[PDB]
A paper describes a structure:
In some invertebrates, including the earthworm [name], haemoglobins are large extracellular oligomers with D6 point-group symmetry comprised of 144 haem-containing subunits. Giant haemoglobins are arranged as 12 protomers (1/12th units) assembled around a central scaffold of 36 linker chains.
The structure of the giant haemoglobin from [name] at a global resolution of ∼3.8 Å is presented as an example of the use of the [name]-4D procedure. We demonstrate our approach using the giant haemoglobin from [name] as a test sample. In the present study, the data were acquired in movie mode on a Falcon II camera, resulting in a 3.8 Å resolution map (EMD-3434). Our [name] haemoglobin reconstruction (global FSC resolution of ∼3.8 Å) is comparable in resolution to X-ray crystallography maps. In the best parts of our map the resolution is sufficient to distinguish between large side chains. In our sample many more ‘top views’ than ‘side views’ were present, generating better statistics in the preferred orientation. We conclude that our cryo-EM resolution is in line with the size-related resolutions achieved in X-ray crystallography, and is also primarily limited by the size and flexibilities of the complex.
Numbering used by the authors:
A (entry chain G), B (entry chain K): 3 to 151
C (entry chain F): 1 to 145
D (entry chain O): 62 to 222
E (entry chain M): 64 to 225
F (entry chain H), G (entry chain D): 8 to 147
H (entry chain N): 65 to 229
I (entry chain A), J (entry chain E), K (entry chain I): 5 to 151
The structure:
Amino acid sequence: HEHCCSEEDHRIVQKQWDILWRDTESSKIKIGFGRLLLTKLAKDIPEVNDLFKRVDIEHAEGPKFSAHALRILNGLDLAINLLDDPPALDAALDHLAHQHEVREGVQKAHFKKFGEILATGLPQVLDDYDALAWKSCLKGILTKISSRL
Amino acid sequence: HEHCCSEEDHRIVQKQWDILWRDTESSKIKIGFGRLLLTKLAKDIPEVNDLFKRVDIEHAEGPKFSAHALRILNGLDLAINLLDDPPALDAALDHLAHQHEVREGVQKAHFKKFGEILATGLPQVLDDYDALAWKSCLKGILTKISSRL
Amino acid sequence: KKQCGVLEGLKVKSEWGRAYGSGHDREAFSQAIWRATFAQVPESRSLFKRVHGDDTSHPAFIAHADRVLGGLDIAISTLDQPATLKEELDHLQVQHEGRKIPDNYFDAFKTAILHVVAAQLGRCYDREAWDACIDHIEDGIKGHH
Amino acid sequence: CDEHEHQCGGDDPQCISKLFVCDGHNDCRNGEDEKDCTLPTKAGDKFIGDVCFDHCTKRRPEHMTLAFESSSIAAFFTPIADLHVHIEIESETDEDESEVSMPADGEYSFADHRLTIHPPEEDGLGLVGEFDGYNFDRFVGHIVHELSEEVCAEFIFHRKK
Amino acid sequence: EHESECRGDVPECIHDLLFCDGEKDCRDGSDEDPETCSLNITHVGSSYTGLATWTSCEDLNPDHAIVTITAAHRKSFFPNRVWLRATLSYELDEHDHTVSTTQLRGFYNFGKRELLLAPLKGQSEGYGVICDFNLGDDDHADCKIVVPSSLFVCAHFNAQRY
Amino acid sequence: ECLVTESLKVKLQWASAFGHAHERVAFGLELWRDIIDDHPEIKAPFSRVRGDNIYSPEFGAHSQRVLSGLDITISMLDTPDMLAAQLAHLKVQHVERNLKPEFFDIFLKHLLHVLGDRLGTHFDFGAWHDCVDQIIDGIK
Amino acid sequence: ECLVTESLKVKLQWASAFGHAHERVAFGLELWRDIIDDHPEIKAPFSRVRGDNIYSPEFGAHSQRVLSGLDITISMLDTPDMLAAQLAHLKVQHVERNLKPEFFDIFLKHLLHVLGDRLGTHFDFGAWHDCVDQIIDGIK
Amino acid sequence: RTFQCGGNEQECISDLLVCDGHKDCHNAHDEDPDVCDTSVVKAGNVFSGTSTWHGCLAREDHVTRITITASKRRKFFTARIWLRALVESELERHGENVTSSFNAKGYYNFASRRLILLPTDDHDDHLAVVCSFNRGDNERAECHRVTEATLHQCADLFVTLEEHD
Amino acid sequence: DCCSYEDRREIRHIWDDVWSSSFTDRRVAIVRAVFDDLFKHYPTSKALFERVKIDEPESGEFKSHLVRVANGLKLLINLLDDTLVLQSHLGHLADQHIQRKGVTKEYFRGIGEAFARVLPQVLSCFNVDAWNRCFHRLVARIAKDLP
Amino acid sequence: DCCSYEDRREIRHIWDDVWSSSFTDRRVAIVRAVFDDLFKHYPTSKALFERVKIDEPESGEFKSHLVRVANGLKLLINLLDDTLVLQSHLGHLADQHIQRKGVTKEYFRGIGEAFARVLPQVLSCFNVDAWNRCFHRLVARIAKDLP
Amino acid sequence: DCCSYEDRREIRHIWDDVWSSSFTDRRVAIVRAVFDDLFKHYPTSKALFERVKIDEPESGEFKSHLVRVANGLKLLINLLDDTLVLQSHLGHLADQHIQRKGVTKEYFRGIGEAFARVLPQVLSCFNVDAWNRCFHRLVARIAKDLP
Ligand code: HEM
Ligand code: HEM
Ligand code: HEM
Ligand code: HEM
Ligand code: HEM
Ligand code: HEM
Ligand code: HEM
Ligand code: HEM
């Protein structure tokens, strides 16, 4: 009987979120749209820049880092398309938290920014959307990640 | 062979060709629209002028010639409305060729013009149409006529 | 030479988009692959003792399978850039390397995807085209080719 | 089917134009268009309808009656077989116990199983009978403004026994 | 809408408050016949069922759902409607087999043939249910759980009777 | 201030409103008909394409070649390097004809007009208006 | 000449054409887009609401506050006493900004324009045009 | 294109689980004999019937007959029936009775109860056939021959199961 | 706590029952009873609103106050199907309440109850839970930057 | 030989599979492989196109060539449902090829094959017969006189 | 006597059969036969219409008379679904008949029959009763203020 992130909302999300990938050859979309989200993070909190040394963040267009940008949006994507049938999603995200756990130097307050970037970042890249809906769901994804930190 | 003048095309033709006769009292239409096609022929090839002596072409609005103008479009009309069910059409046109056979002084190169007049004449009198379609069918009607000459 | 054939590379890139769809059918499209695989190799379930791979309809497992397709989506997404592929793909190597996967299994998981795609897809696709591309990815994760 | 065409197919649809049903010879390659040439409505047959709803108001009757003077078949060409019909209507109001029986002449068509009645009075109300095709004890036929082709009032007729 | 055709040979269209009245308002007087007055459907204790798909709320995944009729009264002076009370019950899927249980009241309309219910008041997760028995027999249905305000269609379940 | 995120959005909205086929021609001809009613002199240079009557064919042909150009432009608008190349080749076609530099600045005003009715209230003017400038300046 | 009957009609027709929800915003923004194309200077005072680009939000917000005002006005338009009170409070909001008295007389011309397309041929111009004056004069 | 259970209760299930040898619907309508009914395409069955043509390849109305040749069912992925067949045309062009033929592969859904045949290795035209057994019975069938790409119709034809034995 | 979605459709019907008219007779009498119910629990607030001649319950002016409260309140609701235009118009409506003195963050959380207190008595079918949830996220965004 | 009608609908779908995107990554790689397949059979033609720096396969310029070939080619197709606007735009596209040196009436009939040898590898369902028939009546008319 | 409503739909179809064309050949021949039937019963009226060269049955002018009678008459009918625009256009058409001499109130009630005696021979399905009822209320509103 829990209220937040009700059924009818995520149906709106999946519909709006799918307007981007209606185009074919969308590899370049989410590489680029992913390349911005990590850099725009570094210019707010400079501390996190050290964490991405393993992927060589110093090269923005660099191949070794680009392939990392896919994996984050793609990992986010399966989360959204799985919003329905909740009991699976809990297990899905649980495996991401543990994936961020063994990595050291990841501070809980980071995500709080990463949400605020994305919450105000998203409205530029879509045609229409209800901000109230997205606000509910992304509190679901983000807050449940980091529950291991 | 087997390919030219495919089934789907003449359905377009009959639909467009029928937009003219949606109006009632269309006797005057195809008298007038027929009166132009023969005169506009004489001013390109002057030779053919001699052939129409029997119908008295010298009188444009003349009754004796007017009644001939109907019979040409009307004869063309039954050809178009019979395009479907091919094996009949062959017999239909075969009877026109033989009708032009006993008449002397009818040169095969004439029709080649008469097509070019009509092919560029038609686009003035209709709302919309696909030139590619008409091009296919009128090669069917004309080329099969004169096969006796 | 019946290799990735850089034109043909993007052939499957298009087809895959039509098969791997939106909505909850994806979760169903996953179930097919695994139910197919395990029927070819009964003893392969032992490798999944950690994920509750005993029964395949359990929620904890459903999550597992999406990541797998989710992961494979990344692969087929980019066969255009031979650099980024080798980077992204090389990541998968260290994922599987820490345990014993015979070259027999992911030969069968190859056979599994083909059949499922054919059914899921719109009556038209070229096997020998697909056969090459995913096999290139298989040579990838195995670590040596 | 298409427009004026008629669908003869029992198990293997064959689409034929309307003018060949009970034509007198085999056109449908089934052979199923010649089985039906028996006419269903014989002289003396009397149908009585009850009202369904009525907006074409001459007398807005409770219920009206229909009888057959005589059917007749044009010998040579018989998809259509013309009819003489009375239409009796026994009204009642404040004042009067009025009556009516206007004669008219329609035709029954073996093609689509419809019968028609051409307007009995100058008011231009055609009555359009329609059988289902397998029954012939009742039809759902209803009145139409002959000029406009608009459904105005329905009646459900029955044969009397 | 707001009327129900009659049951007989000749279809008429008569207003919904005039069935099972005790006065014949049709042509044939279809309204007096036990092919209509039969109460077999709202006799106390009957219960409908059939697993529900949820579109609008709770997204629980298809699980059984029953409706049941706890007590029925028909007032002698206004026989047009059968006032009644019910209890809706549907299986939440958590771990153990569990069920939340709304409680209901509403009327049964002989016109539409459709009983319709509503949540009582101060009841957790306030839903209402609309069952149309427009099929031939007095069993089976096409119901729907709705939100009581909008009559917006929350969950649709095609229900039978055991 | 454009070229990144704010550029990407122009692509998606270009796909939708631009339509397809017979719907495309109807779009183009609905554009020019705006500006010629506003600025009557503009039809002087079109005597080559019989811009006497825009509804006539052969201009219909022209105006589609026009919009097709924006496709080439807007399509490659992500990759900055290759962008200038088309902008370079494009200007060359407009060197040999009598223009005013004010007609360009006029054009983008009436183009973003017509997209209004089809998109109603949904789009970023800021994204378009500034990012069509990056197309228009390359022509000067 | 505005009276008990000829006023009443404006209320009923205000209900219909004004619409609701997402349809309301689309109505407002379709209004201003009329006048700004006609009288370009009018966008000078809106630099506070970023009236640079009307399609941008925050102006969308504004223009709805506008129409909402007419509701308050037209809604109470029957009872004459309480009418002036809102008209009194309303003018106060417009005292402190640079206006011309001609923009008002312009406004009602282009407002009754847009209602034309949605109502086609059905309404009393006389009722509106005169009874919007009783709203407009209270602002002077 | 998803399988609809029906009965006391009803809801969607994705077409790829229909007859899989696992319970997928709640009441098991999908793993039943009357829906699975493995053989409506058992080899040797022959279907026949006429075909009007209102599409391309315009010619007179004639008779056709598809005959199923092959059948296969991989007992790991049991959900579809891969099969071969041969397509016959007894049309009379002129001067003789000339008979076209070609081989065709394709498959047969249990969910949608419709088989689909595409011609193989055929440089010649030979337009593909698509059936459906919507009748609820296993003799009759509605088919129409379609272009392989757009999938828009042409040549609506009906067929009957030629008598066994 | 998460306006969600369905709750908004729940509102849009509830609000359509109270607001339906071109006359102001009804919209007034309802909102006036809101504050008339408010002042009974916070008589201190009544010391404010002196600018509008509060002390006259039926003034030729005071109505012209409540009327703009409704049309402002109704202006909120008709945006819920379109967000992002709410924030802008929300932030605006906030600042119009900080330019004066005597508006306490405690007063807003009071009127949240005031509707729940007596808004049902006008309607029949009513969802207390819904109207109460989506109303805070309106009001708790007005008192953010205010004392 | 008679483009007919159905063949055009056949095209319109085929062309919609290759062209579908707002990015140019795909449309480039396909058309580049057309000429890359052309030059292997007519190396003499490669002596032309020197103006565009053909010698560089990867140039910042050469792409800006092929891109306009596509958008020109795609411009043809979207007219097939509306003729009479084709001829005008056909005759235009013809004259832009007579103003230069080195047009082999022979090379047009060459590239007709070039697609037929490099299409069937990008798509799956494909009609060789259709695409080959309606493509000549395009090219046979852009090589009307000579060159 | 009460044009009613259904009678008007009855007209709108009847009138659509006679008027259907873009040519004037038919619309002329019908209306000319109206007056040709009129003058047979009121030869006195024929003394009027001298301005239009009535004496020539086939004049290059006289047609240009009857043509405006039709297009005026047809202008009436196409207003029957929208009244209140009839009165205005009715009153106008009335005054154009009082500015001359020799127009008797008796003549209008004559032509009312003129259509009825010879209007159908053109159509097949026709309602005499309808056309006759709604036509008076047109004409009896022209002869009101006229002698
Ligand atoms: C919001 C949703 C996010 C998702 C779904 C996500 C997902 C992932 C996943 C799955 C990985 C592991 C890649 C692999 O094992 O192949 C990864 C790596 C990483 N993520 Fe995230 N992430 C998210 C947000 C964040 C945020 C906000 C931060 C930091 C502020 C962060 C920092 C990292 C770092 C540092 C790595 C290290 C990768 C490496 O060393 O190669 N992530 N992310
Ligand atoms: C394109 C379709 C045409 C059709 C369907 C057509 C049809 C006919 C028919 C049926 C007649 C004979 C009338 C009768 O039997 O009583 C006729 C007469 C004739 N047609 Fe055509 N015609 C066509 C085109 C032409 C052309 C292109 C020419 C000359 C360039 C031509 C020259 C004649 C001549 C000279 C006669 C002699 C009629 C007479 O003296 O009475 N026709 N046409
Ligand atoms: C194209 C073929 C394959 C791809 C692309 C693939 C990809 C992946 C990916 C992306 C993960 C995610 C790991 C994580 O999120 O931490 C994973 C995990 C895993 N894969 Fe695969 N895989 C493939 C084939 C196989 C096969 C054939 C097997 C075994 C028969 C296998 C066994 C596993 C196991 C056991 C894990 C989970 C390890 C754990 O839970 O500790 N994979 N795979
Ligand atoms: C805004 C972007 C513009 C683009 C991308 C563009 C593009 C083009 C193109 C591609 C052509 C034809 C080249 C060919 O047929 O081979 C052309 C021709 C032309 N453009 Fe534009 N154009 C633009 C703006 C303008 C404007 C604002 C005018 C104003 C009148 C203009 C006037 C013309 C004229 C008159 C021609 C015809 C040249 C001729 O017939 O020789 N263009 N343009
Ligand atoms: C026609 C009836 C009009 C009404 C009912 C009206 C009503 C209002 C209202 C309610 C406000 C905002 C008060 C607030 O937010 O607290 C306002 C502001 C404004 N009005 Fe009007 N107005 C009207 C006409 C006009 C016209 C014709 C103009 C012409 C430019 C105009 C220009 C403005 C401007 C610039 C503001 C902005 C004040 C600011 O942002 O600080 N108004 N009006
Ligand atoms: C609950 C939702 C509320 C809304 C939507 C709202 C909205 C408004 C609006 C639009 C105005 C008119 C502003 C103008 O004309 O520019 C106004 C005036 C006012 N509001 Fe509210 N209000 C609310 C509640 C309250 C409360 C609870 C108080 C005090 C306890 C308050 C105190 C005032 C005062 C004093 C004014 C008068 C401004 C003046 O003196 O001119 N409001 N309100
Ligand atoms: C098959 C269809 C073809 C189409 C639709 C086509 C169309 C075009 C177009 C639109 C341009 C740009 C013209 C401009 O900017 O005004 C172009 C450029 C060019 N095309 Fe083609 N083309 C085709 C095939 C060919 C072939 C086969 C050749 C040579 C063998 C050729 C040689 C050229 C050359 C040399 C240019 C560059 C013009 C220059 O030097 O400035 N094209 N083509
Ligand atoms: C029955 C319906 C009739 C209609 C709707 C009608 C309408 C008209 C109209 C519109 C004109 C042309 C006026 C103009 O150009 O401004 C006209 C002319 C005329 N009508 Fe009629 N008319 C009718 C019957 C009659 C009858 C019965 C008479 C006499 C017996 C009559 C006498 C005339 C005359 C004399 C003119 C010529 C005006 C002139 O001398 O220039 N009309 N009518």
